C-alpha cells in the first residue's frame, strides 16, 4: 500500500462511524496533520475542499487523489457509498509514499479501503438505524438589525421616500394603499384584509421562520460479514435520507448495496471482486452565493420587517408584497411546487483482481475496474399559474452517462541473498480512461397539467435547439520501485515512474518522475536497552511528482460554430491554443521523527517539508486586447515550508476507567517565486487579493482610518507617508492608489485539532475539536447592511442611527450619503474553534444476553454535531466562505440518536 519510510496517517473505522452527512471528508476535519478540510455549504449535496500541505498551484486544482480499493474515483461517486462499509482511510502525504499512484499525486492521495469478512465459523449480522434533526447554527447576525417602524422612520428622515414627507403619509397611502395590486387576482382579491395582511406596520415578521426550517435525517443499514476456510465476504444494504435545512428544497437520498468477495481457488491463484451499486436522488439550492431580494441569509437579514409573508393563522402564505412590484412575489414552498425538479442516478462500480504465484517469490497481479453512472433529470414550469408571466408551461429533460474504465497490472518479486539483505522489486502498468456525455431536450407551450409530454408543445417560434456535451480523457503510466532492507534498522526505497496524459500535446505529454527515501530504526540498534523509551524511527525522503488537472482540450487552437442567418453556417475563433503545454513538476523534501514512550502510552510524530512547485500551470489572465479571457500556460513557481506534529496518549487510572486524548497541529508558510510576464506583482481585479514575489497571496486593500469629526467624511490612510508628529497621514478622497498589500493570507497558515475520550463500564463519551487560525474573510453582506449611500430600501444595521449630523457630532459611524468601499473594515477575523462531535454511547452489558442465542450485542448513541463554535466573525458561518462571505448556506447543527443490534 505504501513504503515503510513514507508519511502515512491511518484513520480507523471508529472515526468513520455514523456521521449524519453524505460528505465524508468533513468527518476528517482535524484528524490528519497537514491535511486541512473546509466545506462551504450546509447543502446536503456539497463536497468538501481538501488541501494537503498547503496549496500547490494557482491555476490547476490542488485536490488529492481519492482512491477506493485500487481504482481512483471522485468525491461525488464516493458520496453514494455507505460509510459503514469502510475499514480504514490512509492519507499518504509524501513523495515516497505516493509513487505507484499517479494522476495528481503531487497533492497526496487518499486511500479508502473497504471492509472484508473475518474468517470465523459463524457469520456476523449487524442492523444499524438512526434518526436526527438539523437546524441552523447561528442567529447572532440578526440580533442587531432594525425593526419595522424604526426602519421606516430612518428611511423617512434620510429622504428616501420623499423630500417633504412624514411617517404617516408614507405608511398610509403609499405602501399600504397597495390593495390595488391584490385586487387584480381572483385568488386573493377577497383575502386582503380578511386573512392575508401583506404589509403590517404593527408587528415584526420573523423572516428566519419564513426561509429556514428544521429538517429530519434518517439512515438504516444491515450487513452480513462472513468467512470460511478460503473465502471471505462482506455484503451490505442500506439507505440514507437527508433533508435540506433551508426552505428552498435541496435533499439527498440514496439506496446502496455492496458485495466484497475474496477467494483462494487453489494453491496457485487467488481471485476477488468487490462490487457496489446505488440509486441516488440529488437536488441543490442554486441561489446561495448570489444576491437576490428575498432569498437566503441575505434575505433573512435585509428584508424589511413590515412585509409579512405569513397569513393571519401563522402559516406561510403563497405570496408576499414588495412596494413597486407589478406581480406578487412567490414564497419558497409555492415556488417549489410550481417549479418541480427530479433527478435519478444509477451508479455501478465493478472491480476485480486475480493474483498468480507461479514460483516462490514473484506474484503477478491483474486488476480491472469499470465505473458507470447514468443520471436522468427532469424539470417543469407549471401552466395556469396566476402569479407567473405567462399561462403556458415548459419542460426540460436531460440524460447523462459517465463511463470510466481502468486496468492495472503489477509483478512483484521479493527475495533475500544471504540472511539479512531482503530486496523487493516491483514493476507495473496503469491505464485510466474516461468518456462522458450529456444530452438534453426541452419543450414549451403547454396548457394542461395532464398533457405534458415533450412531444406536445408548440411548433412555431416556440421550438428550441437541444443540448449536447462530450468529454473524454486517458492516462498511461509505467512505474517501478525497489525496496532494499538491512537486518532490522535500515530501509532504502527507490522509485521511477513514467506518466503520459491525454491533456497535453503529442510532443509534451510524457514525463519522468523519481523518489528516494530512507528509514532508520534507531531503537533496535543503538538504545535497545532503555527504561522509558520504547520506539524511535527516523525517516527522510525526496522525490518529484507531477500534476495534470487542467481540462481536457486546453492546448488546441480551436474554431467553433457561430451562426448568423438560418441559411448558412458561420465559424468563429474559440480558444487561443498553447502547443507547448506539459506537466507541472513538484519536488518535495521530507524529514520526520517518530518516537514512543511508556511502551504504547505516548506517541509523538514530528515532520518537516518544503514542496517546491516548478513549471506551475497557471490559467494566466491575458489582457483584454487579445480577445480571450485566459489561457493555460506553464509559467511560474511557488514554494512552501512547513512543520506538522501529532501526539496521542492514554492517561487512565483504574480498571474500570479508560481515558485517552490526542492532539494534532500543522503550520506552513507559502511563498510565490515567479509569476508569468516578467511581473513583480499581479492584483486580481475586484477580489481583494494580490500575487507577489516572496509572499503568499495576501489581501490587497485600502486602510480605513475612521471619520472626520469636523465634516463627517470617511478617512483612509495614505500608504508610506508619515506626518511630522509621527502620526500617519489621512485623506478623504478614495482612489485605487490608496491600496496596498496587507500582511494577511487567503489560505490559513495554522490548522489543527484535538480529541478527548472517556470510558467506564460500558458508558463512553468522545469529543472532537477542530480549529483554524489566521483566516480572514471579506464580509460582503456588511456592504449591504451597513451603508447609508445606496440600497436604502433594505433593512440596515442598528448602528445607522447615531450617524454624523450637525447636532450628533461625537460618534463613529459616518454621514449618510456616502458609499462604502471594500477596505480593511470589511475584512474580518474568521478564525474559529469548533466542537465537531460529542458522541455518548452505552454498549449494553453482556450479562443481559444469556440464554438467547438470537442476539448478543446492542449499542445506543446520542450524537451532537457542530453544537459549539467560538469565533469573532459576525456572518452566520466562518467556514462557509473563502475570500468572501456572499449570500451563504450556513452549516448545520445536528442531533442524532441511533441504535445498533449486532447478532
Amino acid at each position: 500500500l505504501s513504503t515503510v519510510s513514507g508519511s502515512v496517517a491511518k484513520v480507523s473505522s471508529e472515526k468513520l462511524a455514523e456521521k449524519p452527512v453524505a460528505n465524508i471528508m468533513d468527518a476528517l476535519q482535524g484528524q490528519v496533520a497537514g491535511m486541512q478540510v473546509m466545506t462551504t455549504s450546509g447543502d446536503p449535496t456539497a463536497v468538501a475542499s481538501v488541501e494537503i500541505h498547503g496549496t500547490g498551484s494557482l491555476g490547476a486544482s490542488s485536490a488529492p487523489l481519492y482512491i477506493v480499493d485500487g481504482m481512483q474515483t471522485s468525491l461525488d461517486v464516493v458520496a453514494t457509498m455507505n460509510p459503514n462499509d469502510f475499514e480504514s482511510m490512509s492519507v499518504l502525504k509524501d513523495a515516497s509514499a505516493t509513487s505507484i499512484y499517479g494522476a495528481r499525486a503531487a497533492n497526496g492521495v487518499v486511500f479508502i479501503q473497504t471492509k472484508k469478512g473475518k474468517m470465523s465459523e459463524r457469520g456476523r449480522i449487524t442492523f444499524n438505524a438512526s434518526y436526527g434533526i438539523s437546524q441552523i447554527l447561528n442567529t447572532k447576525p440578526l440580533d442587531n438589525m432594525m425593526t419595522g417602524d424604526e426602519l421606516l422612520d430612518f428611511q423617512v428622515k434620510a429622504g428616501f421616500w420623499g423630500n417633504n414627507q412624514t411617517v404617516q403619509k408614507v405608511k398610509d397611502m403609499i405602501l399600504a394603499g397597495a390593495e390595488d395590486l391584490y385586487g387584480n387576482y381572483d385568488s386573493l382579491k377577497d383575502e386582503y384584509g380578511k386573512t392575508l395582511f401583506p404589509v403590517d406596520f404593527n408587528h415584526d415578521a420573523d423572516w428566519l421562520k419564513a426561509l429556514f426550517k428544521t429538517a429530519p435525517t434518517s439512515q438504516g443499514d444491515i450487513s452480513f460479514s462472513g468467512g470460511s476456510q478460503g473465502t471471505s465476504y462482506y455484503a451490505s444494504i442500506g439507505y440514507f435520507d437527508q433533508e435540506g435545512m433551508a426552505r428552498e428544497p435541496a435533499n439527498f437520498k440514496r439506496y446502496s448495496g455492496r458485495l466484497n468477495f475474496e477467494s483462494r481457488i487453489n494453491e496457485w491463484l487467488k481471485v476477488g471482486a468487490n462490487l457496489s451499486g446505488a440509486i441516488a436522488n440529488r437536488r441543490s439550492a442554486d441561489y446561495f452565493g448570489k444576491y437576490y431580494m428575498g432569498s437566503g441569509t441575505f434575505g433573512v437579514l435585509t428584508m424589511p420587517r413590515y412585509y409579512n409573508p405569513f397569513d393571519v393563522n401563522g402559516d406561510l402564505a403563497d405570496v408576499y408584497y414588495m412596494y413597486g412590484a407589478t406581480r406578487p412575489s412567490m414564497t419558497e414552498p409555492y415556488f417549489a411546487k410550481m417549479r418541480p425538479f427530479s433527478s435519478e442516478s444509477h451508479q455501478a462500480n465493478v472491480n476485480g483482481f486475480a493474483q498468480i504465484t507461479p514460483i516462490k517469490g514473484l506474484t503477478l497481479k491483474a486488476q480491472a475496474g469499470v465505473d458507470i453512472t447514468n443520471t436522468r433529470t427532469s424539470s417543469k414550469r407549471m401552466p395556469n399559474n396566476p402569479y407567473d408571466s405567462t399561462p403556458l408551461g415548459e419542460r426540460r429533460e436531460r440524460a447523462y452517462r459517465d463511463v470510466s474504465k481502468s486496468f492495472t497490472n503489477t509483478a512483484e518479486y521479493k527475495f533475500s541473498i544471504d540472511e539479512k539483505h531482503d530486496l523487493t522489486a516491483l514493476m507495473g502498468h496503469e491505464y485510466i480512461e474516461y468518456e462522458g456525455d450529456v444530452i438534453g431536450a426541452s419543450s414549451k407551450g403547454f396548457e394542461s397539467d395532464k398533457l405534458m409530454l415533450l412531444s406536445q408543445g408548440k411548433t412555431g417560434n416556440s421550438l428550441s435547439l437541444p443540448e449536447h456535451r462530450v468529454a473524454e480523457y486517458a492516462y498511461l503510466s509505467f512505474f517501478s520501485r525497489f525496496n532494499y532492507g538491512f537486518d532490522k534498522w535500515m530501509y532504502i526505497d527507490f522509485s521511477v515512474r513514467n506518466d503520459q496524459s491525454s491533456r497535453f500535446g503529442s510532443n509534451n505529454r510524457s514525463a519522468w518522475f523519481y523518489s528516494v527515501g530512507g528509514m532508520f530504526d534507531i531503537y533496535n540498534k543503538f538504545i535497545q536497552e532503555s527504561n522509558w523509551l520504547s520506539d524511535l524511527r527516523l525517516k527522510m525522503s525526496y522525490g518529484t511528482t507531477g500534476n495534470s488537472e487542467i481540462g481536457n482540450y486546453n492546448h488546441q487552437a480551436l474554431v467553433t460554430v457561430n451562426n448568423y442567418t438560418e441559411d448558412a453556417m458561420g465559424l468563429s475563433i474559440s480558444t487561443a491554443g498553447n502547443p507547448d503545454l506539459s506537466w507541472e513538476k513538484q519536488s518535495q523534501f521530507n524529514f520526520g521523527l517518530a518516537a514512543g514512550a511508556f511502551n504504547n502510552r505516548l506517541s509523538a510524530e514530528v515532520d518537516f517539508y518544503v514542496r517546491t512547485t516548478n513549471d506551475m500551470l497557471i490559467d494566466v489572465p491575458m489582457p483584454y486586447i487579445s480577445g480571450f479571457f485566459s489561457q493555460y500556460q506553464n509559467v511560474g513557481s511557488m514554494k512552501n515550508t512547513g512543520v506538522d506534529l501529532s501526539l496521542k496518549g492514554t492517561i487512565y487510572q483504574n480498571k474500570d476507567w479508560n481515558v485517552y486524548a490526542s492532539a494534532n497541529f500543522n503550520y506552513n508558510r507559502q511563498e510565490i517565486t515567479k509569476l508569468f510576464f516578467g511581473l513583480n506583482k499581479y492584483m486580481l481585479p475586484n477580489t481583494g487579493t494580490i500575487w507577489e514575489i516572496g509572499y503568499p497571496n495576501s489581501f490587497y486593500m485600502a486602510e480605513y482610518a475612521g471619520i472626520d469629526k469636523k465634516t463627517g467624511k470617511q478617512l483612509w490612510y495614505v500608504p508610506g507617508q508619515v506626518d511630522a508628529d509621527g502620526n500617519k497621514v489621512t485623506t478623504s478622497q478614495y482612489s485605487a492608489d490608496l491600496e496596498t498589500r496587507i500582511d494577511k493570507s487567503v489560505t490559513p497558515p495554522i490548522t489543527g485539532g484535538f480529541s478527548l475520550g472517556a470510558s467506564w463500564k460500558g458508558l463512553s463519551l468522545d469529543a472532537d475539536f477542530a480549529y483554524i487560525v489566521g483566516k480572514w474573510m471579506i464580509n460582503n453582506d456588511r456592504y449591504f447592511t451597513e451603508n447609508g449611500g445606496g440600497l436604502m430600501q433594505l433593512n440596515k444595521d442598528k448602528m445607522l442611527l447615531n450617524a454624523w449630523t450637525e447636532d450628533n457630532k461625537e460618534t463613529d459611524v459616518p454621514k449618510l450619503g456616502q458609499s462604502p468601499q471594500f477596505d480593511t473594515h470589511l475584512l474580518e477575523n474568521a478564525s474559529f474553534l469548533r466542537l465537531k462531535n460529542l458522541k455518548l454511547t452505552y454498549v449494553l452489558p453482556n450479562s443481559l444476553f444469556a440464554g438467547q442465542n438470537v442476539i448478543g450485542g446492542a449499542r445506543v448513541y446520542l450524537m451532537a454535531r457542530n453544537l459549539l463554535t467560538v469565533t469573532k466573525y459576525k456572518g452566520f458561518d466562518p467556514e462557509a466562505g473563502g475570500n468572501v462571505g456572499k449570500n451563504q448556506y450556513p452549516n448545520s447543527k445536528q442531533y442524532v440518536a441511533g441504535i445498533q443490534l449486532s447478532f
Partner: peptide, 13 residues
C-alpha cells in the same frame, strides 16, 4: 428571486 442587488466582489479560491 428577482432584482439582483449589485456591487459584489468576485471570489477566487
Amino acid at each position: 428571486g428577482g432584482a439582483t442587488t449589485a456591487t459584489t466582489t468576485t471570489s477566487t479560491s
